[PDB]
C-alpha cells in the first residue's frame, strides 16, 4: 500500500477544535485568537467569493474552504391566517393540533394566547383583543367537548416549540417552526429569538420551593384538566424529568383531591389528571428576563427566555 497518500488524508482528518490557547496580551488581538473565536455563518451573499469564503458548501457542518454546535431542524406548516395573527412576535411556543381528518394539508397550529380562548369558550383581555372570534378556532377542533370530556386531549397535541419565521401570507399562512435544535432566526440580518411566554400561565418552580447550581434549566408545558376547563401552565425548573413528574405530583396533590371533591370519576377515564411535556433547555443563569408585549390598545406582561434550545419530549401523565 502507500503511507504517502494516507499521510495527506490523515492530515486532512487531523484537527479537533482548538480548546486551549495561552494568550499573552489582550490588546494585541492577534490572528491565533481570531481563528479561535471565529464562528462560521449559515447564510451569505449568493456570489462566488462570499460563498467560497463563508463556505455553505461544506458537508455536515460549515467551514471556511464537534464544536458543541449543530444546525437546527425545522417544522414548516401551512395554516389559515384566520387562526394565526401575523402581528405576534417571533419566539412563541406553538402547539400543533392533530386533526382527525386523514388528508388535510392545512394544519391547526395554536399560539397559546389563541389556545386560551378554546379553553374558555391581564391575560383574557389580550386574548380577546388578539383572536376576536371563538368560532374561527372552535372549528379547527370540531369536536372539542367530547375530546376533553373523555380526557383525550393531551395525546392529541404535539408541541412544536418556538416559531422563527412567519411570512405575512394573506389567505393561507405559512409559518416556520423550529421543532428541535438551537433557536436562531432565519434572517439575512441575524438577530436573536426569545421564547415569549405570557406571565399569567408561566409559573416558576425554582422560586416556588423558595443548593447545587445546574448548568441548564428546562422549560415545561403542562395541560391540566381542571374543573373550570383545561389550563396551560408553563413550568420552569432545572431538574430531571422523573423529578419533575414527582414534584408536580406533590404540587397538584391538593388539586387531585379538589377534582375529587367537586366531581366523582364515575367512569374510569376521568381519573387522568393532566399531562406534562418538556420543551428544551436553556442556561438557568441569564434566563427569562421579564418584559411586556405590546399590541394596539393594551399590553400584557411576557416572559422572554433568552438563548433557547428546543428539544420536545412526549406527554407524561401526572395524575
Amino acid at each position: 500500500v502507500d503511507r504517502r497518500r494516507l499521510q495527506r488524508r490523515i492530515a486532512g482528518l487531523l484537527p479537533p477544535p482548538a480548546r486551549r490557547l495561552n494568550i499573552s496580551r489582550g490588546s494585541e488581538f492577534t490572528r491565533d485568537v481570531r481563528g479561535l473565536v471565529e464562528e462560521h455563518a449559515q447564510a451569505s451573499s449568493l456570489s462566488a467569493a462570499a460563498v467560497w469564503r463563508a463556505g455553505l458548501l461544506a458537508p455536515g457542518e460549515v467551514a471556511v474552504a464537534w464544536s458543541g454546535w449543530r444546525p437546527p431542524v425545522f417544522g414548516d406548516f401551512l395554516i389559515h391566517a384566520s387562526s394565526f395573527n401575523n402581528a405576534e412576535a417571533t419566539g412563541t411556543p406553538l402547539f400543533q393540533f392533530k386533526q382527525s381528518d386523514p388528508f388535510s394539508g392545512v394544519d391547526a397550529v395554536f399560539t397559546p394566547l389563541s389556545l386560551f380562548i378554546l379553553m374558555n369558550h391581564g391575560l383574557t383581555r389580550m386574548a380577546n383583543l388578539l383572536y376576536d372570534s371563538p368560532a374561527t378556532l372552535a372549528d379547527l377542533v370540531p369536536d372539542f367537548g367530547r375530546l376533553v370530556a373523555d380526557r383525550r386531549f393531551h395525546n392529541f397535541i404535539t408541541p412544536v416549540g418556538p416559531l422563527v419565521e412567519n411570512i405575512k401570507s394573506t389567505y393561507l399562512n405559512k409559518i416556520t417552526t423550529v421543532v428541535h435544535g438551537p433557536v436562531v432566526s432565519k434572517a439575512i440580518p441575524r438577530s436573536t429569538v426569545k421564547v415569549t411566554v405570557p406571565q399569567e400561565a408561566f409559573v416558576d418552580l425554582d422560586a416556588w420551593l423558595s443548593q447545587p447550581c445546574p448548568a441548564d434549566a428546562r422549560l415545561y408545558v403542562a395541560l391540566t384538566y381542571e374543573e373550570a376547563g383545561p389550563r396551560f401552565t408553563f413550568f420552569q425548573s432545572s431538574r430531571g424529568h422523573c423529578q419533575i413528574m414527582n414534584i408536580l405530583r406533590i404540587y397538584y396533590s391538593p388539586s387531585i383531591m379538589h377534582r375529587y371533591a367537586v366531581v366523582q370519576p364515575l367512569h374510569i377515564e376521568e381519573l387522568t389528571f393532566g399531562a406534562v411535556a418538556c420543551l428544551g433547555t436553556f442556561s438557568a443563569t441569564d434566563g427569562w428576563r421579564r418584559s411586556a408585549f405590546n399590541y394596539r390598545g393594551s399590553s400584557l406582561p411576557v416572559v422572554e427566555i433568552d438563548s433557547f434550545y428546543s428539544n420536545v419530549s412526549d406527554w407524561e401523565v401526572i395524575l
Binding site: 500500500v1 503511507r3 494516507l6 499521510q7 490523515i10 487531523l14 484537527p15 479537533p16 482548538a18 480548546r19 486551549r20
Partner: protein, 148 residues
C-alpha cells in the same frame, strides 16, 4: 545510596510486504485504484470441448462449447486506531518551551507510530484475508485424493 537505571529498550516492528512474503506466488496482483466503483467483476472462459469420432452405433455428440463465467467477490477490511486528545492538542499548538518541545516530538512520534500501526495492521489483514480466501476455496485432501 542510589538506584541505578540500566536502560530502556524497545522492539523495532519489522514490516512485511505482500510482494515480499512467498504467499504471493499463489496470486496475481493488480492496482485497480478506485475499486469501490467496481460493483461486479466477470471473467469468462470459452472451453470448446472436442470429441472422438467413434465407430460403433451411439448418439453422436456434435460441436460442443462450454461458456463458463466466474464473478469476483469483494473483501472490505478495517481496523481501528486511537489517538488521544492531549497529544493532538500538542500537535496543533506551537512549542516555545523545551519541556513543551519535548512533548511535541513525543506527540509527533506517537502519531507516526499510530499511523505505522495502522498501515502495518492493514498489511497483516491483507495477508490474513488472502489466506482466508485460500482456505475458503480449498477442499480437504481426503476429497481431492479421489475427485482429482
Amino acid at each position: 545510596k542510589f538506584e541505578v537505571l540500566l536502560g530502556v529498550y524497545t522492539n523495532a516492528i519489522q514490516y512485511v510486504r505482500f510482494l515480499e512474503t512467498a504467499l504471493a506466488v499463489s496470486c496475481v496482483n493488480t492496482e485497480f485504484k478506485d475499486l469501490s466503483r467496481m460493483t461486479d467483476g466477470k471473467i469468462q472462459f470459452r472451453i470448446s470441448v472436442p470429441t472422438i469420432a467413434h465407430g460403433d452405433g451411439r448418439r453422436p455428440s456434435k460441436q460442443r462449447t462450454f461458456i463458463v463465467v466466474k464473478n469476483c467477490h469483494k473483501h472490505h477490511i478495517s481496523t481501528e486506531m486511537e489517538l488521544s486528545m492531549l497529544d493532538l492538542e500538542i500537535l496543533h499548538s506551537i512549542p516555545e518551551t523545551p519541556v513543551e518541545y519535548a512533548e511535541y516530538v513525543g506527540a509527533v512520534k506517537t502519531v507516526a507510530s499510530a499511523l505505522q500501526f495502522g498501515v502495518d495492521a492493514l498489511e497483516r489483514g491483507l495477508i490474513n484475508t488472502v489466506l482466508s480466501v485460500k482456505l475458503r476455496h480449498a477442499p480437504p485432501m481426503f476429497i481431492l485424493q479421489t475427485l482429482a
